[PDB]
Design a protein around this ligand. Sequence first.
Ligand code: HEM
Lengths: 497, 497, 497, 497
Amino acid sequence: RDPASDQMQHWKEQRAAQKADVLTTGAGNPVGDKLNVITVGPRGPLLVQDVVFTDEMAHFDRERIPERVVHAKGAGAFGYFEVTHDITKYSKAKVFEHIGKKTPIAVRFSTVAGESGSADTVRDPRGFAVKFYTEDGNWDLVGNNTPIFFIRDPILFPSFIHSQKRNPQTHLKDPDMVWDFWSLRPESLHQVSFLFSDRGIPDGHRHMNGYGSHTFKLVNANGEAVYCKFHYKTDQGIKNLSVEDAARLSQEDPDYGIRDLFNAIATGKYPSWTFYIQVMTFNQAETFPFNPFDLTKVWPHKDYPLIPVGKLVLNRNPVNYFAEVEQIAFDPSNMPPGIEASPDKMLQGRLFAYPDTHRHRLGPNYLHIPVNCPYRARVANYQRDGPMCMQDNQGGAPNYYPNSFGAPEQQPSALEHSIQYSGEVRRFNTANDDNVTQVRAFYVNVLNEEQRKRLCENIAGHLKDAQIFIQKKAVKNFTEVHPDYGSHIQALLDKYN
Amino acid sequence: RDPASDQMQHWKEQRAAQKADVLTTGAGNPVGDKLNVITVGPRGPLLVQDVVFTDEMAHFDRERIPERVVHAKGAGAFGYFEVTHDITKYSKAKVFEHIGKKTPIAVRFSTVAGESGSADTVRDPRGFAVKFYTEDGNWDLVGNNTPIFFIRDPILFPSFIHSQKRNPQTHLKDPDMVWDFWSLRPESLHQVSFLFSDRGIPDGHRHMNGYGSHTFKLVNANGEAVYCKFHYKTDQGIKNLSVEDAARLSQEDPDYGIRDLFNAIATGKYPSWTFYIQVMTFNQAETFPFNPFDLTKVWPHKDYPLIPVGKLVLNRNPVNYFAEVEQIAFDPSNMPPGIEASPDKMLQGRLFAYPDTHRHRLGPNYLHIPVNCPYRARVANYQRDGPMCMQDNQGGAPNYYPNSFGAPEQQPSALEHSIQYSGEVRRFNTANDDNVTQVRAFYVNVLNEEQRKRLCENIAGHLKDAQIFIQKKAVKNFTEVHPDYGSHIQALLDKYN
Amino acid sequence: RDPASDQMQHWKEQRAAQKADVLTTGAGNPVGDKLNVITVGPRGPLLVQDVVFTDEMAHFDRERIPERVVHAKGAGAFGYFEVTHDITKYSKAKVFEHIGKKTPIAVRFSTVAGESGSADTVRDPRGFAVKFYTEDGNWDLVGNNTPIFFIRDPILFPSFIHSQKRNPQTHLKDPDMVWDFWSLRPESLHQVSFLFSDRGIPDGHRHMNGYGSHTFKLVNANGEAVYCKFHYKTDQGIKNLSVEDAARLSQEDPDYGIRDLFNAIATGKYPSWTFYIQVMTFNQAETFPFNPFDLTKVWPHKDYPLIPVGKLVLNRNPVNYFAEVEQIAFDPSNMPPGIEASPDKMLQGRLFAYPDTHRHRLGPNYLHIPVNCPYRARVANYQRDGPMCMQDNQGGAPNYYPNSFGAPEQQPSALEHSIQYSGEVRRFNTANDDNVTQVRAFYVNVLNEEQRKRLCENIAGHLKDAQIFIQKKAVKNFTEVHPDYGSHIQALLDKYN
Amino acid sequence: RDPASDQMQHWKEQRAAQKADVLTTGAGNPVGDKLNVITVGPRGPLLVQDVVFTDEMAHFDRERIPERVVHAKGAGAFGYFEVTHDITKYSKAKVFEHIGKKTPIAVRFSTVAGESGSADTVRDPRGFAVKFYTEDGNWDLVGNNTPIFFIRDPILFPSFIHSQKRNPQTHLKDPDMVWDFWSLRPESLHQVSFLFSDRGIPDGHRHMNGYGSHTFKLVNANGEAVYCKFHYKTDQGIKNLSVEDAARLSQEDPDYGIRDLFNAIATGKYPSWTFYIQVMTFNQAETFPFNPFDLTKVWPHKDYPLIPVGKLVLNRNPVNYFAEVEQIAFDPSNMPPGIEASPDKMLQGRLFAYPDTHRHRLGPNYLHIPVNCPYRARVANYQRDGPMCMQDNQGGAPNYYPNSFGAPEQQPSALEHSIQYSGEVRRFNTANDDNVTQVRAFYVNVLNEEQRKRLCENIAGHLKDAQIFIQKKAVKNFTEVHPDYGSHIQALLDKYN
Ligand code: HEM
């Protein structure tokens, strides 16, 4: 059998030649018997003094924590990030200090809309989150398998996710909801085209690219700032499942990506991604034809070539899935000195959203969870007492700042990069921005004829379930992108009806 | 389209001719705009004073509650229970007071081992829980589609569920775990035979029987006690999917049972179950060949014929799934006067387990949730303050008992039925009880030849993945049940290998 | 006896002539007996089937919620806000629509640093929070008995509260911590002078003023904006306890303020506060000698006279303290149209802090708690599912925006007031701002000689416990305010040593 | 100053000669500045990208956990238990293995009815809980400063605590509630007499005795069982405060016991208690004049002399109070092999109540908290996944039992002691048991004349506030105990009225 199937036999084999441990309660008291319960004779009612029973059962009753509101279904792996090129001129980050520096990483792959127990091989954006354990605290590059997203304003994210997920009454997937939202929000045409292309259903997690998707800000030691986009492209090469194969695997193995990643790492075939960046100066940002902080836009490779930085290798499988993969938390706000946020509205929304949801899901002290701890750095601050605190709680150190007792002091070299912003403080409309230019470019330059046909059949296959007026509004947006794109979808929809 | 697909259009149509409501915050403050966020000009960072954004997002971040540790994937419906026969001689329950009495009910169907988002049409025991809103508080008949269970001692339940669910390292379904547990626990042969028969994969929730599965105690007004088993058999008739059809539906519609029940109720075809009971006297219980409180045994129909009581009709679909189906809590401990627990160890374990898990999942005051409230009864007691209390908290009534201020008094007519139990208070072994007699009876009397062949191919198909020694231990147990049963499985396993 | 002592007798008297209600479980099942537990004979162990016991006990085990991180000890009352003057030229708020309009209010009085069960009559700032149930959602004026605060930057608030509260090792009140923080932060001199004056220990909650303390922004129907400060001064007149009387009452009645407010409302003597405002134009704000958004500064009455608006009357006592006072949540972010936030950094910090802590303390759906609900307004939005949801969860309404099914639409008349802000986006130092001018004014104009002497003895009495260097740093700050102020404290400290 | 006051200076002195640590976020990212917030210029609104602010504040908002439902106000200390005598004939416990064996202990002192921040020096039963870190898991002797309690049935405990605590409407202490409950429950006369004697207000925690109060069961290696009562009497001698001194200290130092214990341990004066036991055979238990498992009765010293076992010494103060004292959990169910529960109904109720409340207060995985961990024992079991899990979660070990992969096995030598119990399974009344015999004995043998007078004045002083009929019912119970006892109280009450 494959290494995944032989987990228990491998556990037994690695622990051969030693006697079984003593079965104990949570409090370490040895258990006399855990196959029978205390009764008033052979056919008597259960006793309260059955402390072993009530302890076991009570713990069983509290096993489930809340699933992630998005990217619930996931697969986890560990490894390192190796620097191969010098980008010290761009960033002063300790992760990019010198060439050959290895930083340990934790990675989680996921499907955005799928719940815990849903099929892996489905058409959906794939999450690609990376946690760098840097000497200057954790760095969380929370990325996707796509360089863009559907929307450009973070207030629409809850709406988008509600439309992608189940109907509130019927609890069913509603193409009506999906295509109503997408037809009303035409800035999603670019991401929709990517999603319904061949790379919508990647063959496992090893054969997909990864993108930060946001514009980030790199600051050097001299104090100069530039703009960045992180790319981590697969070294195993892009490889995708057909709709028929994906449909087969959905019933055959709904845990295809978990099994594929576990077997790949277990057999020694360590998957690797090459870390690239694009650089954009402040004058280039001001003279960019589009909004350079727009999440629905990309930076063309001819104007902004990829600059190699390093490689990401995954070599270690999780020991316990719940402890290392279910409980791992990725905060985009976790950025070390040299890396900062850009004015990208979406990124600004993510800075709040993640720590808030982590306090709900995992708990107030979720950063004390071993996988979440910045173990390669020293934490010292005036943050004290919360529920489930598993540290000394910084012992008897003064818990107020400023003080006169040598408590932790602020480091002035870790200040943020200052910038002057113009205009009023109000709500600016971005729905009426360019929605079709880069979509047309992708359609008529990147895709070939058979790829365009497959794209149109995939969209038409999903969109046929929506109401007539929603189909018309969707096809109108596809026609405004390109007339052949719209006409082909419309022809297929007419065939389907 | 089907009624399920037209949920939004039906919502719009029923609310036609009125203007859209004002979009407000949680605190009822009208929202100016919820499509854009407040920025420092068109390309500026997000402001903290964007209260609308942070409120929406914070609520979005806290949407997920923990799924049920078991029976996570479920479908909900509402209706009534109509009494058709007089059983007042057996029980003094207000639910069975007089003929033609309608008690409102809430029902939830489920798959035991499936997570939220797993396929509906899979081989697994189906949950069939019924909540009777009786005038003497709620009655929760938390039943299955099978009259028996796998185990007879409640301390093994967490072990059984862990074996049925994912591997702790790989997070994959492990036939190794499933068949190791089943082979080591041969009292599961009866339930295994039922599970791998044709009724393992019922065609939706309308074409399956329901059983309390436990022995219950009926007490009449005179104070005499008897033993009972609740049966609720389908009026639509038993109907099952083939393995191939089930495998197809798993990828086609993973929400087959939710869609089927919603469409059935929406179109007017109300499904119904006929409520039966078996009665066993205390002398019959003492002279029963087996343990009558053994959950792996049934009461034969020739010795204990079914006595009709009433019918269960489901006529109303849930308005909101989360509010009415996700948050519904069924406590087997919720039993009105006239219905009591028997010495069945499993039932004794369920009396503790359910209220404990409900306090974790839903919260301390989960009985204040509308679907969980005993709205057809008056609650008055000395239970006060907890988190998320949405009552007057019983106002200014004395909160101690006994008192001298006319606070709620105990009703002496609601006392439990007293019984003398013999033997020591210790752990009695029940693993070595009869495990094969009723299994043989079922195999060679109920099933025909083609049903026996399908049963053997289904078991062999699942068991082939297990290690050789586990296959041998499983086949040995099947051989001890019946030599043809064991030999046929072994022949198919040899073919598979 | 006083009305407070006769609560139970009054309950009995108002419910005379009716029989005691039936004692039930949470699930409404009548209790047979709740004075004895089920045992295996007279001297036998307790049974698990004692469902009544385990239900009662389990609810008892979950009674405590987390106390407020600050203002834990509190007293609650209800009444109304009556408009007496027209300020429609300043604000378009429905609370200020027309003269004679009564809005129901909920008020909570509190001590900032005291825990639940601490003494009422102690030297500490008193909280004065008011919840207006306006037709445009709830308005929460979360005020103090002082027009200023200790600090002017919200990042120092956790530090300030940690210094005021117990030592992390010893769990004792530490004057060392208090005076170290106050000596290092000399912008606290103004609030310290107010706190150690006669009005530090007010005689109950009826004899103290209330202030919003922040600069707020009033917007009229025409769209013009001004700046505001809310004052609500006592109609019963300012009245204070001596240090000796306060020290006596601390042991005699630690619940002096709760008893005083309950008896005052119960006997019919309804306390009232007169609602005033100060108005500041944008040109006046730009030409103000100090920062007009500085929380440590006041607006002088000669330059900015008080403008009457209405009166606050408290007429109803809480029915249940836990339900109505412990669980009440005041969000400064809850502001109806016509009232907005100013650039006051402290207010900006409060906009985030309160909803975040409420989700922790009370729970995600804390606005479903009756006292927190905006019951005089209609809530409709795309916020769905959370723990402990006790609404229809907005039934089957579309849960995404924008949509095409007539779901709640944004009201364009409720937009925020736009303003252009100059300067870079960075951290600006405000520690070096004016700290002594208004403190000197208060010392040498408002206070008389005997009031100055009492102020100095109160400060010296508290400060004597601190280390010598902290005493020197504190006295230096008092000397920089005024030489007589510093010299008198120093003389008293030398006497104490 | 005393060592308690010099905590911060001692921290500074022990960490002298090293530079202050770098101020970091929770994620270990160095903080640039934590005195100012990011604004849009000097007088601009706060930015969302202020990650340092929102992290600090969010953690501050989640500092409070629920206080203990009882014994909220507490003081903690650590040390060891040294065996001085051989009791191996009675118990096979590893804590009592051999003479001179030192087991580390954690102790918490407390006041039963006081909230967090209430006065220490008040008339109330004092908690005396001891956590033995035995090699066979933790042993929690959760005791009081009194050998008895008020009630003998655990279903009345929530009622008793509600009566002792605040009124549900007024939130005030109600002598009406206290004396109504005590007058209706005359089995409290013994504990009431002890409480209103001189030992009601002990001088700190070092000058009070400690009792298990329950009958426990000692089992030896041979398998013989006896009954036990644990006594731990002070080596510093019994010492009490007068009512006047206690009333003074209530305002002077409400944290008298915390300061006293901290200073005692800090100066080197380690307090010690001598561990005694009483032994009762099964024949003696059957021929005892009273119920030997009755919590309101004692075992007379003449019939059952004290047998020395060892001494309890407290030598170490807590480093952090929240981590070591607030979060410590004592489970009476935590009993190592050789120590078991008796049929005492109260003890049976405590076996359920404590683990249930700990899961609410601290969380499901509260035994992972360092102070709660059985660090001197190895925990291995099939308890997996819960919220806030900070272990490997037992890695990849099989999570079901029984199994075939060498997972932890049950130890047959740790079985419970079996006993045959007679009588029916129902609710037996114990309210009508003897309530006056041992109370009379205590009154007329132990107390002298001036002690009897003080006892009567203390009761009369508290009882005068109750209604006339409650005073009559209380005095009647005191008269039934002894006519002089009743007559003296009545005379003082008549004087008070
Ligand atoms: C940066 C500044 C401040 C922060 C971070 C802050 C934070 C908090 C927090 C977390 C609470 C607990 C609320 C709960 O859990 O129920 C609270 C309560 C309170 N705060 Fe503040 N606060 C600030 C400034 C002020 C100011 C300036 C005032 C008055 C002028 C004030 C008055 C109050 C009052 C009255 C309460 C109690 C509310 C109640 O009755 O429930 N606070 N504050």
